[PDB]
From Swiss-Prot, chain A:
Name recorded for this polypeptide: E3 ubiquitin-protein ligase Mdm2
Function: E3 ubiquitin-protein ligase that mediates ubiquitination of p53/TP53, leading to its degradation by the proteasome. Inhibits p53/TP53- and p73/TP73-mediated cell cycle arrest and apoptosis by binding its transcriptional activation domain. Also acts as a ubiquitin ligase E3 toward itself and ARRB1. Permits the nuclear export of p53/TP53. Promotes proteasome-dependent ubiquitin-independent degradation of retinoblastoma RB1 protein. Inhibits DAXX-mediated apoptosis by inducing its ubiquitination and degradation. Component of the TRIM28/KAP1-MDM2-p53/TP53 complex involved in stabilizing p53/TP53.
Necessary for interaction with USP2: region residues: 1-86
Coverage span on the entire protein: 25 to 111 of 491
Source organism of the structure: Homo sapiens (Human)
Related illness: Seems to be amplified in certain tumors (including soft tissue sarcomas, osteosarcomas and gliomas). A higher frequency of splice variants lacking p53 binding domain sequences was found in late-stage and high-grade ovarian and bladder carcinomas. Four of the splice variants show loss of p53 binding.
């Protein structure tokens, strides 16, 4: 695959890690968000599925101060809140 | 289990 158009706050996140376009696949969106979390070291060092997004644009995007990478449906749901799906 | 390993299961 689907093409998506990130809303502005997600766009700013994507761009802070090198993405320069306005339309993405979900795969690109997940890759860049992954890069954002890794590069900013937002994950718990001991339990690396835990991500802290408070005090960060990611927390404003997601609306939660923390989440677990294992929470697949919650992650996608949060991402979709911040995307318009093409078509 | 590394962050990278976890992130991959999302795909």
């Amino acid at each position: 695959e689907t093409l998506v158009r990130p809303k502005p706050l997600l766009l700013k996140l994507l761009k802070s890690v090198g993405a320069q376009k306005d339309t993405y696949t979900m795969k690109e969106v997940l890759f860049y968000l992954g890069q954002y979390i890794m590069t900013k070291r937002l994950y718990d060092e001991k339990q690396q599925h835990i991500v802290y997004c408070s005090n960060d644009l990611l927390g404003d995007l997601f609306g939660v101060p923390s989440f677990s990478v294992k929470e697949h449906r919650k992650i996608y749901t949060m991402i979709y809140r911040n995307l318009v799906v093409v078509n | 289990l590394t962050f990278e390993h976890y992130w991959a299961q999302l795909t």
